Each structure stands twice: as C-alpha cells, then as structure tokens.
Design a binder for these strands. Structure first.
Ligand SMILES: [Mg+2]
Ligand SMILES: [Mg+2]
Ligand SMILES: [Mg+2]
Ligand SMILES: [Mg+2]
Ligand SMILES: [Mg+2]
Ligand SMILES: [Mg+2]
Ligand SMILES: [Mg+2]
Ligand SMILES: [Mg+2]
Ligand SMILES: [Mg+2]
Ligand SMILES: [Mg+2]
Ligand SMILES: [Mg+2]
Ligand SMILES: [Mg+2]
Ligand SMILES: [Mg+2]
Ligand SMILES: [Mg+2]
Ligand SMILES: [Mg+2]
Ligand SMILES: [Mg+2]
Ligand SMILES: [Mg+2]
Ligand SMILES: [Mg+2]
Ligand SMILES: [Mg+2]
Ligand SMILES: [Mg+2]
Ligand SMILES: [Mg+2]
Ligand SMILES: [Mg+2]
Ligand SMILES: [Mg+2]
Ligand SMILES: [Mg+2]
Ligand SMILES: [Mg+2]
Ligand SMILES: [Mg+2]
Ligand SMILES: [Mg+2]
Ligand SMILES: [Mg+2]
Ligand SMILES: [Mg+2]
Lengths: 296, 211, 169, 159
RNA sequence: GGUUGCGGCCAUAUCUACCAGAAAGCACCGUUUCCCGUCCGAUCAACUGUAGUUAAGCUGGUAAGAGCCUGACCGAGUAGUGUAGUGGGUGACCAUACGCGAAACUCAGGUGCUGCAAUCU
RNA sequence: GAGAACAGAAAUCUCCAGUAGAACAAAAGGGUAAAAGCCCCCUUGAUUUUGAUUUUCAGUGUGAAUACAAACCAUGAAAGU
RNA sequence: AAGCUCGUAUCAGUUUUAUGAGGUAAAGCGAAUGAUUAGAGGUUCCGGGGUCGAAAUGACCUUGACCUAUUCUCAAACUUUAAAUAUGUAAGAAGUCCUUGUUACUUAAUUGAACGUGGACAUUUGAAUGAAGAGCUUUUAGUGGGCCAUUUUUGGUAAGC
C-alpha cells in the first residue's frame, strides 16, 4: 500500500488478532456469551437458540444448541423449501419469513413428540400471543431468538420468523413492539395490519397500486407473478394454504442429490491449486538467482 | 566538594537511574564517547584493542572523562588525530546519592551527587580500532588511562576486525566474497533470509561466486 | 478488466466555515437548505482559539451531504463557476476531489440581502460499485487494490466527461 | 504510610497473559461444575466481579455449592499453627477443572483392567507404583564406536 | 473436495504484494407503495429475484516476503541458582564439591486444524 | 497522511491508515474495542427483608467487597443484565 | 499440669510421581515503554538560516527535526521470554462400577441435580521413608526491652550504626 503507511515488525509482532468469527464480521461475541451461557445450576441443560438469518433472498432457520466442540443443529428449515408448500416467488419477504418459522416450529415440535399437543394458533388473526403451558403436561419447547447482527427495527422481518415460530407452537419469549403495526406514539398493536403482513398484503397492495399507476415497473419487478398468472388478490390464499400444507407434512424432504459426495469432490478438486514442496520452492529461487542476478 | 571516589567504589545499591522518580540528577562529566576518526570505514582499521575490567566495581563519570582525555590525548599527539577510533564503551547511567548537611540521622535519604558506570568483570571499558602498525601507540594510550581508574583492568588484543563481530580471517572470507557492503562507520551483511528481490538490489557484487 | 468497476460519485458535501453562531450562521444554513433541498447539519467548535474568536462547542459551520443525480447538478452547476479547470492538487491520493467558490450567487440562486453572501467548500467522494463492503454491518471488509479509487483513475475520469481541465503539473 | 488494600501487590498477578487480552473464549462458560469437583483458582483481571483474593491465586479447592454464575469453593488456608476452612464464592471465569486427579482416575480404571484381566487369567498382578529403580547391567559394543579421547583445552580470549 | 448457516480452538488463521477460481452459494446488484431510519434509502428498513456482475468481498496459490508457530547434544551445561568447607584473595571478588538449570543467538521444518446442519459437477 | 473559498501552526468539511499509542471524576497499577471508551433512547436496583462469605482478623469489631435466597421494579425482540 | 476417647492406628518442618500457581535471578533493547553514543541513506508547497533572483507550490548549498536500515550502552518503581530455592492439590473402602427409588428444585421431557434402597471386586487396597502411637477437652504460669552468625537485603561515606 502507501509507502509511509503500512506496518513494522513491531506492529505485526505484538498484534493480538481478534477471534476468527469476529475477523469475519460474522459473530457478535458479547451477545453470543449472553445467549449461550446456562445457569450453572442447570448443569448440562442446553440453551437452544433460534438462528434466523437472511442471505440475499434465502432465509435460514435453525434451532441450535452449543458445545465446546461446536454447535448442534436440532432441526433446520430454509425458506427455499417453500416450493414444497406452494410458495414459488418472493421467498425473502416478511410473509416468507413467517412461514419458514412456522415450518421450523412444526418441524422440531414434531420430531420432539409435542406434535399433537401444542399446535399453537391455527387461526392466525395476528393477535399477540406466546404459546401457553399445557396444564399437567409437558411445558412447551423453549427457544431464544438469535438475531445475529441483524438490526432491531420495528417491523423488521427477523421478527416475522419469530411470529411464525411463536404461532407455530414454539415457546419463544417476545414483546410486540418490533412487529409492523406497532404504534410508535401509543403502546398499541393494530392486528388488522399485522395479519396483512403475515399473508403478504403489503406486497399484494404494491401489485394493485402498480396495476393502474404504471406497468413498466409492474412488469420489470413482479415479472414472475405474470408468468404464473398470479395477480395480487390470490396472494392471501396462497400463504393460507401454505400454512395448511406445512402443518400437514413438515417432515423435511432432503434433496434427491444426483452425484455422490465423492463425485463433487473430484470435479471441485480439479479447480483447487495445490501447495508446493520446499525442493520445488528452492528450485524457484535458484532459477531467479540464475537469471535476474548474473547480468542476464 | 566531590567525595573521594573511594566512597562509591563498589556496587552496594540497586541501579538508581535518572527517572520520573529521580529527576534532580546532575549531568555526566563525560558526554562524548567517540573520538578520533569515527567516520572511518570498517576496512580502514582492522586492529582492535580493548580496555577490560577485572573487577565488579563502579567508575565515576569524572574518572571516565578524565581517562578519555588522557587516552585520546596521548594517541593524537603521537599517531595523529586521524590514526585511531577511541570508543568509550561504558555509559554512567547510575546516580550516586549523598546525605549533605540540625538533626543527624533522621530521614537520611540523600540527593544526587554524581554519576557512575556499573562495571562487570571482563566488561569492556574502552575499545580502540586502528591499523596493526599503530598497535604500540594505542596500547600505551590505554595503559595511561589505566592510571585514571580504580581497580585492576587489563588491555587485550582483540581477535576481531575493528569493532566488527568477526575474527580477521572470517571478515576477510566474507568481504572478498560479496556479502559485505559499507555503511556509516560500520558495515552491513548480505542475509540469506528474506525477500530475494532487494536482497540482490543491495549487494550487487554478490551473485557471481567470484571476485 | 472493467465490467462492474466503473466509477460512481459517492456523495458531494458542501460546507460553509463561518467564525461564529447566530444570525450569520443560520443564514449560511438557509443557503445550503434551498441548495440541497435536504435540511443541513450544524457543527460545533472543537476547542477554543480566541484569535479565531470561538469557544468550544460554539456552533461554527453548517454543511450537508448530497448523493446521486442531485449531486451531479450541484457539482456541474458549481463546476461551471470554476470554468471547468481544477489543479493537480484538489485530488486526494485516496481518489476524491474538491474545490471552493465564494459568492454562492454565482451558481443559480438569486441574492436576497436578508440572506447575505457566503462562500462554499465543494468536496466530492468517488467510489466504484461494491463500495458497500466497507460500509455495511455484517462482514465489513475492505476493497481490493485493483478496485480502490486512485488519483490517476479519478483525474483521467475527470478530464473525460465534464470535459474539464486539470492544469498545473 | 503503609497501603494494604484488597488488590495490593497484584500488578503482574492479575495481568492478562501477553497477546491473550480481550474477551474470554466461550468454552469457559460451557464447562460444567458439580459439587465435589476439584478446581484450580486463577483470577482473570478482565472480570472484576466474583474475583478471588490474591491469596487464593494458584490454589486448588473443592466446590461446595453451585449458583447461577458461580461455584463456591472451600480452601484450607493455614493461619498461625492450624488450618481454617475458607469458603470462596467465585465467578466461573476464575476457576478451571483440576487435572490433579487425572493420573489417579487414569490409574484406577487401568488398575481395574489389569486386575480382572489377570485374576480371570490366574493372578500375578503387581499394580502398585514403584519409583525409578537403578538400571540393570548392560554390554556396550565397540562396533563402529571406538572411544574418542578428549582432553582439557587451553585458555583463549576471542573478544 | 467447494460453499453456506451456527461454531470450537483463537495469527500455522494476522500483515504486504501479485496471480487464479468451474458448478452451486454468498455477494455486489435493482426499486422506494408499505413498516422503519437518516442532513443523505451510503448505513439502517421494506420490495424485487425481476433488470446486471465476478470488478470487489470470499476461497486458494505465489514470495531466498514481514510476522507468527514448532524443533534441535545451535548457543549452553553457559548465565543464574540450592547445598559444602578453619577453600583462594587486603579487598572487590573468585575457584572447587553434590545437585538443579535458563534467555538471547544460530540452524532446520511449517503457514490454520476442525464440530453440527444444509447445499453443489 | 492526502485533499477543500476567506483559513494562517491552530476553525469546519472528506477520504485513507490507525492493537489502542485514547478515554474511563481523582493517585497509581490493573482492566476494557460491534467495549468498560463516544452519541443517543428508556429509566431509578443508589430500592425492600434478613442470613452466609472474602480482605484486615483474635479468624472480634468497623470499613469495603463477593455469591445466593425472598420481594418489588428497570431496561431490552430476547437471552439476559 | 490434669487427663479423656481409642489404638495399628491414624500420623509427618522428608522424598517420589501426577497436576497447578508465581515474575525474582539471569536475560532483552537491530521487541513495547523509558533512557543513551555514533555515524549512513532518504523525505518536506512546510523550523530556520545563505547564493541566484520581480517572484514562484523556485532551483542550489545548508543546518536542524523527523522516516529507513544499522550501531555503542542501561532500568527498584520497564519488558516479550524466564529459572534455582520456596509454594497449592492429588496418590482409594469417606474407593470404583451396575441396577433404578425420593423431591415442592431443575428439564421440552422421569430430563437433570442432590440423597438413597439393591448388586460386583479385599488388602501389591494402589508411590517412598519413618512412626517410644493417634485423636480430643479443660485450666493456668512465665513472656510480650531481645541480641548474634552465614545467605538475601533497605537507609547511610561509613560504624562494634
Ligand atoms: Mg527484524
Ligand atoms: Mg483486541
Ligand atoms: Mg447486541
Ligand atoms: Mg523526603
Ligand atoms: Mg587501574
Ligand atoms: Mg507503601
Ligand atoms: Mg497490618
Ligand atoms: Mg460493582
Ligand atoms: Mg456462478
Ligand atoms: Mg478476481
Ligand atoms: Mg462472506
Ligand atoms: Mg516468513
Ligand atoms: Mg569465603
Ligand atoms: Mg559463580
Ligand atoms: Mg494495622
Ligand atoms: Mg479502607
Ligand atoms: Mg514484585
Ligand atoms: Mg524486573
Ligand atoms: Mg536484572
Ligand atoms: Mg530475554
Ligand atoms: Mg527499548
Ligand atoms: Mg525513543
Ligand atoms: Mg529549507
Ligand atoms: Mg512439597
Ligand atoms: Mg515402619
Ligand atoms: Mg507404638
Ligand atoms: Mg497469658
Ligand atoms: Mg500476657
Ligand atoms: Mg507493647
């Protein structure tokens, strides 16, 4: 870099590097410690996070516990599994985030055995609720939202996933004030709006308001909605049946997979440079001091 | 008002540097440690003769400077002010206190008085480089600075080229080869470690394995 | 190669350094408001000087940052006043550039003796796409050398479109 | 006058281990402690809460109790001519599981093995530990190895 | 083997300079009706996965590279040290006897390993 | 460090480098970097009850401190604190 | 002093083995901080001086400061490293393994946590050496000016200080 910039032996020597997952901007350890650590009188009782992540337009949902060797995925649901349930587009958005949580909620709670007891809320009117303790019977599965580095803003979709896992029957302690339709200037939740976000009616209203006010954009974005002949009004029943579809068979289809691991290893190792031997590297110096040095 | 140097001769106290905690200390009577032709090149002066201490004792700055005179004086007026490099190898960093003086012994911590260099056994006091033909002038030079010091010190012919770290044949082997290039009063050495790029930039006359 | 690396202008930041607060400074704020369209931001003195007649935290100088097309306009509209000739300085070795003009009247913008006359500092930050990598929250990285904005690359970009002149040496 | 406060004299004692500063790595809180474990006490300057006093630095004790963030440890500290029982309340950051018993736990399940696998064979055990014995006789060959005779060297200088 | 999400150890993972990266992924990337945040939709929030790109990130390789890690009868059984004497010396100090024993230095080798879940010629 | 009208060594604006060389009332020493520092938002846990524990020690007192129990609260989406 | 409860028992100003803790000695300074001798090579639109000059964000000497690779020397209140001596814990019957009870704590959960019922293995039963035994209670004297030697070590020129 810049000459009078850069770095000495002294600097580099005494430099204490951060962790890996901090040097990668991936992990907030201050909060990780406070999410993972268990009450020392609960001994080996794991503390299960809900890890909700957003790639560019894929949604990750993992219910995760920790171990000094690594973490442990109990169950995992990606929003790119939504095709199985009847959602082919816009699986990033708030109502895609919702359903993916409901998928993860049904999925784990099934392989746990709390499937038939603790169904959560089937209705989804969007009232504020967390899943209550069933009298003389198992307390619900308890899981804590791992937001990661996602910024907490009122309405953000990271809490969309929360609502689906919470409405799915998981116990995930939460307050209201970060759901869309949280009135800033009174502590009040408009549920008629929150339902609109669970079913996608903020996207449907974009479609409608872009039906008669422009078609240049309505074709650019919302392209695929044409090509499948889906225009707004049906969006509510799309997701409403996806919820039915999820609670009917959450069980996680893995991919058919096509080409064994050994196969993928083969082709991908072609494109991977391999290191050198000191003998090879010594020959590269001896070559240089032959040419470069001895006056051509 | 200088207490006889007998009083601080031995090393009785932990090192007492001038420090944030000391602050009041006077200045060393010896301020110049390099005399004669000290710009001179490493090849110019192969012959090295040290003044070496045989005691574990303390040398006052006032005795240091006074000997530095006597030695550099004898050498310039006989072999000439360019014929040698005298290097005082010992810096008086340690502060001697004194309890000056009404109560007698209450609260007796003294105030800085002079400075001294704390000297080991076998530790070099003076180092001189010249050419071999000047030897007997150099040696009588230090031999008189001897009289300026407390405690036995012995003069010693170095096995080394000047102030370099190498014995005379090993310096020759390295210098007739490419590995040695001039600097300052000292030299630098071609390292077989590091970036090959500017390893060759510097030391161009290597990378033949010839003259 | 050069597909996605082109050159966007990150932002243009105008700034007016006035030696006090009160009326003279709230006027310099009006200048930048109707010029930017976005409300401007005040700055307080960092310490006390008394030769510059300022107490620490005094409210010295308003400024504003403008992005996108709106900056191209105030760039060019002010670039005009300079007759499209900068200097070999004015361009940072880190790739941005800036100049200054007295009399804000000399680009658009009528007079109003209730608003006075103020000089400005025009500074323009250049960045290629994917500059977000430095500014985002997660995975905050740095841009590789073969991307980072240089002085060369910006002057050559300046001597081209806008058809201005670099001058000096 | 004199200064005897709680952390006095602890300059290097609570210092951080060069280039080891910063957060404590997460394993420290995943470790699990039960009553009866032997723990070693090393105070971590970064966590000021629940800190052991410097006397218990480098001291091993037995956990007597377990709380939210902490384990209680008992230590025999000897005052005068006797020992008294001190119980300490320590944050888990200052406490690591002790290896002091692992050579005993290794040797119990090992001595159990060679016990069964011997008796079921017809005895002949010897499972107590013995010290280093003097070595036996041996015959060293001269083959390829003839003694190389050394003598004392004279005085040199080389400085 | 690649990549991703969450990790453990926390430089053999960092730094500097260049070169290479298939598929998938990640990313950069497009929009501002909506919830939300800004002096500024850069950050942040929402919408699109459509309209673009491997340039950057990211992964890897190169360097008698800086650093860092490991090793060795390299230095050095040196410095220091526990023990001993009616040992040496005016002293300062030192030698010896039975033990323990570094650091620098020098030289050689090395440049992340790896847990869970998903995905991919 | 390199840039921008008056603007100068010192005014405000921008980019780059930056292992902390800063700051955290005060002495010094620890400690701290998506913090323990800076800006903002919400607050009164600086509260109630009565025990145990650590330093000083006689294992008295006082001072100060630690980790729980039982309330009532704060704050945060939350784990938590 | 009086004893008292027990007795191969349990005990130790000791070693060995296993596992911790420490920042003194040495060492280090072309590692941080702080000091210190010497040059060499660079960088200024820019600390000052001087020749050219109308000046210059001018060129040329120049002396400083800095930067770069070197060099001589140091630290009770500096330090990456880092001893020797000294120091914590462990070396079994109060042990280890199986089965599966109690609860109001804790778990998503008969999950765990704690305390247990029932079952398996004897003294080479788990290193050395020693043991005119070990454990325990009560009451009371005198003392509460100390001084000396080797080693460590502070103040003082020193002192039979
Ligand atoms: Mg070096
Ligand atoms: Mg750090
Ligand atoms: Mg946070
Ligand atoms: Mg005084
Ligand atoms: Mg003499
Ligand atoms: Mg004191
Ligand atoms: Mg006291
Ligand atoms: Mg506190
Ligand atoms: Mg591709
Ligand atoms: Mg590329
Ligand atoms: Mg990434
Ligand atoms: Mg290297
Ligand atoms: Mg003697
Ligand atoms: Mg000796
Ligand atoms: Mg007292
Ligand atoms: Mg006090
Ligand atoms: Mg100490
Ligand atoms: Mg020290
Ligand atoms: Mg020392
Ligand atoms: Mg060292
Ligand atoms: Mg230094
Ligand atoms: Mg310095
Ligand atoms: Mg000048
Ligand atoms: Mg012992
Ligand atoms: Mg016996
Ligand atoms: Mg007996
Ligand atoms: Mg009495
Ligand atoms: Mg009495
Ligand atoms: Mg008294």
């Amino acid at each position: 870099a810049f000459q009078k910039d850069a770095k000495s032996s002294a600097y580099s020597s005494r430099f204490q590097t951060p962790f890996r997952r901090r040097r990668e901007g991936k992990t907030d350890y201050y909060q990780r410690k406070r999410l993972v650590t268990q009450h020392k009188a609960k001994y080996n009782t794991p503390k299960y996070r809900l890890v909700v992540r957003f790639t560019n337009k894929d949604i990750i949902c993992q219910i995760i516990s920790s171990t000094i060797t690594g973490d442990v995925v109990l169950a995992a649901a990606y929003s790119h599994e939504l095709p199985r349930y009847g959602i082919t587009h816009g699986l990033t958005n708030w109502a895609a985030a919702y359903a993916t949580g409901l998928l993860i909620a049904r999925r784990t709670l099934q392989k746990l055995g709390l499937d038939e007891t603790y169904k959560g809320v089937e209705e989804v009117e969007g009232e504020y609720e967390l899943t209550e303790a069933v009298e003389d019977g198992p307390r619900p599965f308890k899981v804590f939202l791992d937001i990661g580095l996602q910024r907490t803003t009122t309405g953000a979709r990271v809490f969309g996933a929360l609502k689906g896992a919470s409405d799915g029957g998981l116990y995930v302690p939460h307050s209201e004030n970060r759901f869309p339709g949280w009135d800033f200037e009174t502590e009040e939740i408009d549920p008629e709006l929150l339902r609109s976000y669970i079913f996608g009616g903020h996207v449907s209203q974009y479609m409608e308001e872009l039906a008669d006010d422009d078609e240049e954009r309505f074709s650019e974005l919302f392209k695929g909605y044409l090509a499948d002949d889906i225009d707004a009004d049906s969006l509510e029943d799309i997701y409403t049946s996806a919820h039915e579809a999820i609670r009917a068979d959450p069980a996680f289809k893995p991919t058919e997979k096509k080409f064994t691991k050994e196969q993928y290893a083969a082709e991908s190792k072609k494109y991977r440079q391999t290191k050198l031997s000191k003998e090879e590297r010594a020959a590269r110096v001896a070559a240089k001091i032959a040419a470069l040095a001895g006056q051509q | 008002a200088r207490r006889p140097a007998r009083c601080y001769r031995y090393q009785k106290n932990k090192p007492y540097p001038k420090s944030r905690y000391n602050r009041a200390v006077p200045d060393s009577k010896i301020r110049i440690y390099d005399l004669g032709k000290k710009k001179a090149t490493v090849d110019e002066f192969p012959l090295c003769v040290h003044l070496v201490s045989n005691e574990l004792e303390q040398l006052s700055s006032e005795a240091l400077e006074a000997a530095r005179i006597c030695a550099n004086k004898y050498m310039t007026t006989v072999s000439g002010r360019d014929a040698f490099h005298l290097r005082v190898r010992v810096h008086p960093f340690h502060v001697l206190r004194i309890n000056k003086m009404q109560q007698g012994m209450r609260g007796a911590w003294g105030k800085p008085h002079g400075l001294a260099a704390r000297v080991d056994i076998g530790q070099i006091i003076f180092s001189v480089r010249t050419k071999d033909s000047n030897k007997d002038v150099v040696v009588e030079g230090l031999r008189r600075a001897r009289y300026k010091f407390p405690g036995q010190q012995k003069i010693i012919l170095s096995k080394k080229w000047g102030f370099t770290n190498l014995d005379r044949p090993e310096y020759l082997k390295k210098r007739e080869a490419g590995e040695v290039k001039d600097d300052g009063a000292f030299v630098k050495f071609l390292s077989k470690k590091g970036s090959l790029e500017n390893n060759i930039r510097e030391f161009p006359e290597y990378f033949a394995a010839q003259a | 190669q050069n597909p996605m690396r082109d050159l966007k202008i990150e932002k243009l930041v105008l700034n007016i350094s006035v030696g006090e607060s009160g009326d003279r400074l709230t006027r310099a704020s009006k200048v930048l408001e109707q010029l930017s369209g976005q409300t401007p931001v005040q700055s307080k003195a960092r310490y006390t000087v008394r030769t510059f007649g300022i107490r620490r935290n005094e409210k010295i100088a308003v400024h504003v940052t403008v992005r996108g097309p709106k900056a191209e306009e105030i760039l060019e509209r002010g670039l005009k006043v300079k007759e499209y000739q900068l200097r070999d300085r004015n361009f940072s070795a880190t790739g941005n550039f800036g100049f200054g003009i007295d009399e804000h009247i000399d680009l658009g913008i009528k007079y109003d003796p209730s608003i006075g006359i103020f000089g400005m500092d025009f500074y323009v930050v250049m960045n290629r796409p994917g500059a977000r990598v430095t500014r985002r929250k997660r995975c905050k990285g740095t841009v590789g050398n073969s991307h980072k904005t240089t002085k060369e690359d910006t002057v050559s970009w300046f001597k081209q479109k806008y058809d201005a002149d670099v001058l000096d040496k | 006058g004199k200064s005897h406060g709680y952390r006095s004299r602890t300059r290097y004692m609570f210092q951080r281990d060069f280039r080891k500063h910063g957060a404590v790595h997460l394993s420290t809180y995943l470790k699990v402690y039960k009553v009866g474990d032997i723990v070693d006490i090393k105070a971590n300057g970064s966590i000021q809460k629940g800190m052991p006093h410097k006397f218990y630095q480098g001291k091993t004790g037995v956990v007597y109790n377990v709380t939210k963030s902490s384990v209680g440890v008992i230590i025999n500290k000897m005052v005068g001519n006797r020992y008294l029982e001190k119980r300490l309340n320590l944050r888990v950051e200052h406490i690591k599981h002790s290896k002091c018993r692992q050579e005993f736990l290794e040797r119990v399940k090992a001595n159990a093995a060679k016990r069964a696998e011997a008796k079921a064979q017809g005895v002949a055990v010897q499972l107590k530990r013995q010290p280093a014995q003097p070595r036996e006789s041996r015959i060293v060959s001269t083959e390829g190895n003839v003694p190389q005779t050394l003598a004392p060297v004279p005085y040199e200088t080389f400085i």
